[PDB]
Amino acid sequence: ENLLQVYQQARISNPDLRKSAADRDAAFEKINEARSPLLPQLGLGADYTYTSGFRDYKDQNSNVTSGSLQLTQVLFDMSKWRALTLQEKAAGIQDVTYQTDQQTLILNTATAYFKVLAAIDTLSYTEAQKQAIYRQLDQTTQRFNVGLVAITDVQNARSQYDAVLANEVTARNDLDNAVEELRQVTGNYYPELASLNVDGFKTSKPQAVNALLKEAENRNLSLLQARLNQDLAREQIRQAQDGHLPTLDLNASSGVSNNRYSGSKSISQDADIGQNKIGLSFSLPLYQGGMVNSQVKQAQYNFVGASEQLESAHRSVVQTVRSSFNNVNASISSINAYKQAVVSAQSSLDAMEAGYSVGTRTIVDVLDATTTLYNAKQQLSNARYNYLINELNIKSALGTLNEQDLIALNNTLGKPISTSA
Amino acid sequence: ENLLQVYQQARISNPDLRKSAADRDAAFEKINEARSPLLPQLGLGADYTYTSGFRDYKDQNSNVTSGSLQLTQVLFDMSKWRALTLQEKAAGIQDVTYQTDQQTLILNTATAYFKVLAAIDTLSYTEAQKQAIYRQLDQTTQRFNVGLVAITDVQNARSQYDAVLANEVTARNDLDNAVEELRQVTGNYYPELASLNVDGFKTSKPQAVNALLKEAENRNLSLLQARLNQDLAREQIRQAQDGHLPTLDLNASSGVSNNRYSGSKSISQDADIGQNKIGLSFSLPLYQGGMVNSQVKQAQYNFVGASEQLESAHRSVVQTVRSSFNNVNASISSINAYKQAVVSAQSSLDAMEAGYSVGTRTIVDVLDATTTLYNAKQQLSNARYNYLINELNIKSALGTLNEQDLIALNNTLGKPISTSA
Amino acid sequence: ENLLQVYQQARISNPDLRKSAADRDAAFEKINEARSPLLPQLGLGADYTYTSGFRDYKDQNSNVTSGSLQLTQVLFDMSKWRALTLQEKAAGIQDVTYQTDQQTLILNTATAYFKVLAAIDTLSYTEAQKQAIYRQLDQTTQRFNVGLVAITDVQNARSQYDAVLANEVTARNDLDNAVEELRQVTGNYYPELASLNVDGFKTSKPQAVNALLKEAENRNLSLLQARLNQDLAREQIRQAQDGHLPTLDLNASSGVSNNRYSGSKSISQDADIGQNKIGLSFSLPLYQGGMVNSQVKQAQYNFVGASEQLESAHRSVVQTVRSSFNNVNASISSINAYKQAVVSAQSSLDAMEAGYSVGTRTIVDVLDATTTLYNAKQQLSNARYNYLINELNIKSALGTLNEQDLIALNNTLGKPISTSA
């Protein structure tokens, strides 16, 4: 149909993106799950015991029926506060991952679309190669039936034709499997896609690499995730440090009991009482053997690990940006080179035909020139499509990949073409 | 030896499969580990305190020697029941993974076997190519020593011979490394394997793709694992919902104590008592700040995630099945094409020899035709072996991969051949 | 600059290695975190309640102000001891992983260095190929302007020149991206590297494969990690078995309270008391429903799993060693073969030039011979560099990879060469 519509259908019906969204929302709710303990923790309890006497208390039994409405509340517990902040930061991380999955979806959809298109172009060029080989083979066959050309040329052409047939089979299989991958990405089978407009296709030199690097270190996603994890490790250090601190707990209750002491020797008086109390509960772990002073060092070493992960991510980002810039410029230069190559190879094929007419060159040279020509055409098409893919990879490293780049692309796509075979 | 015996030795002595089996059994025992808490939790305790008086209780000491035979039991705790069911479902999942590992073992063993065989065939064809090149080179050398052919042809043939030597070295290394991988899979080194019977080799068109897809969505393993995980997520939702519910606990004891109050101001009476009691313990978390109402939403979002994983698995399965069907048909068509190509290339080589005898064609064309012929033979052999591998991949996507398919294959294998070099 | 200096800069400024070191130290501190509980666990508590009377205790209130200096200590708890030993073993495992990361760093640095060098050599040979093609094209152009050669040869040469231009573009891009990867590894951009000294380059047959296998099974790192995990599983079995055992706990306190009973019906006497006690606390889980007898079976099955992982690691090690030995010998044989091929191809190119002068051979054959010659040169260079890489892979499987092997290598490197283009 088109690239934009394909991305729409994907975004609407892609499961990996939906799973990342689910995880994001699950984290944003784990936030409340962690806020819970800082809120009142009202409860309720009961009991019914039957005490007896095994020795020295013989015949002194009892029948209790107790209830309780225990309530709890936390006035100072920094560990829970830090866990809450940690969960907020993890939610931010999962949001970043959702963004990354959006970008990955756009990129994979475009990659599959252009793989399908390159497969179509390759199949068409291979079929054209086969047709040209068959034309030459038929010419030689007729000129042999009359008595001009020898069986040698016929057999050479037959061999080349068979090889081309095998290559065509391979190309058809590749095209079908590419359509299947496109389906796996989007969900539907596309019998007609939007082709490329080479009559107006043009390449634009990318922007300065230093500006790309600034925009990347500012807006990239893996780097952002790394620095978020660094902040998370800092907060973990603080969480561990908070182990040295006290923990208040405003308790409360509405206790009630119904004692019914029984037995012969039972002397105590049956009492049905109710006890309501409200009090605090301090705590201060003076010493624990080194749990806190060890968790702190662990958290500091994990913070070091996160800092090093951040540096590694910066290096990977620089590599990605530089490689994408370089291979974009390379795709441009190769487009130009393969254009010149196609022109020169068509000229050389005409010259080889002239020579075969004369007698200098041989049909094998003609067929090799034809193969070279059509291989050059294939390489040119693949270079165009790789240029597009590499532009997208650039815009991905920058984290500025969105439907707008896909619109800029779709502006390029022109007439439709079938995925048949 | 043969493919069936190789698979037997593997299944008997493959460590990855054994590890998956170990994990399966570990889960089936974690079942009982989780059933435990629902069973009585009898225990035993003791104590020996020496109380004193810091202020207002001075000279009022004590010496207690207490014992206890605490017993516990759970009459209503849905969280534990749901954990038990969860562990049962995880055991089912691990069983599915064990099945998947069985299939993967069969497939990897066959892949390695056929890689070794293709390496042997490639090495043999390369050696034959070298021998033909040397025959032509010796013919030219003699015809030059007599004074017919020029040094030019000798040097061309020498160059081609050297290139073939290098390719032969590469092929020998590949064969040896393939034998080593086969060993890594099975455990033993195989100096004689069972070759292919091309004199009776034939290709059977696979069954309809729609029937394949039905059988796959019914019997595939990744899809089954995905739906099992979906059910697991449902049970997790119920487990979380169960947080709103009460929790009974039938307590019990046989308490005994021996108080020996000491001190000058000690007025209480020394008592050696025994207290046996049996009672219940209700519980009802009216409010907790949102822990349950948050765990529930988390579980619902994880259920959504599992549903999306299931859809992704369905898509991947469709892709796998369609790709396997397509590349099977492609292997058939390529077998036929490369057969025709080998025939035509042998004919063209004979024609080039005739031409070199005449004077039209040149020795370079002869050697290029020979190289084409033997490359075509290599491609044909590799196409056969890939057809077999792709049949196996089909039967894997369907989840119907077992020793029976390997027997159907081994029926194909014929005379033995050595892995030497 | 050089290989040794590059490895120095890497080791000093590589983030992955630093992260592995951080994890190692974090484990060696988790050791103390786990030793903690076996040490005194002094604490401190307080309380302030206001009891009332709901029914039958009306007007019998209270105002307590309690304190406590609870102390704890563990005299027999085998679970904690086994956890301590487990953490020690995990620290050993992480140390092994740090060693593995050191080796991986050395190997990746060398791989990137030699990839860059091979890219430089390939680019230079491609530029030389282009220059030779242009020389032949200019000769033909002049001989056509005078009236000797036909437009046919001119066009053939033009086509070949264009193809070479495209290949040169690809090579330049590959070189730049390789330099970028080298940067990602080390941290700095290297405009001048140390080239290879082919004038004294030589290959040494590796040592016997059986000795390699002994040294590997003795000093390899994955195998060592596997057996360490096996021992860890044994200790886990013992940890689970320890669930049957008792658990003493030397309690202690310095309790103090200030009761201020209030109310009209309040008859009890206000008391400000202090209670200091010190006692033990036994424990003996006679029955638990099968938790211990199930954890034990789980640990035994996990021990089986670790044993199978160990066997798999042994097999993978054997495969790695045998493959490295084989492909080293293959690199040697291919070096020799490609040397002979380069010599013979240069001779054949001279012969083709002579023939074109005569009239037998054609310019297409000349250019094909030139392409073959320079492809052979590329293959020779790549074979040298792969021989070096495979020597390093050998020394890696043996676990004997260190700065000394890099020094042995750097001894090979000679004059410098630029990474420009």
Numbering used by the authors:
A (entry chain B), B (entry chain C), C (entry chain A): 1 to 421
From the article:
K. quasipneumoniae Qmp M1-977 is a KlebC susceptible strain in which TolC (KqTolC) shares 83% sequence identity with E. coli K-12 TolC. KqTolC is a 150-kDa homotrimer comprised of 50-kDa subunits, each contributing four β-strands to form a single 12-stranded β-barrel across the outer membrane. The remainder of each subunit adopts a helical structure forming an elongated channel. Whilst the β-barrel in the membrane is exposed to the extracellular environment the α-helical segment of the protein forms an iris in the periplasm. The position of extracellular loops within the structure defines the accessible size of the β-barrel, creating a more open configuration in KqTolC relative to E. coli TolC.
Our results indicate that TolC, in addition to its known role in antibiotic export, can function as a protein import channel for bacteriocins.
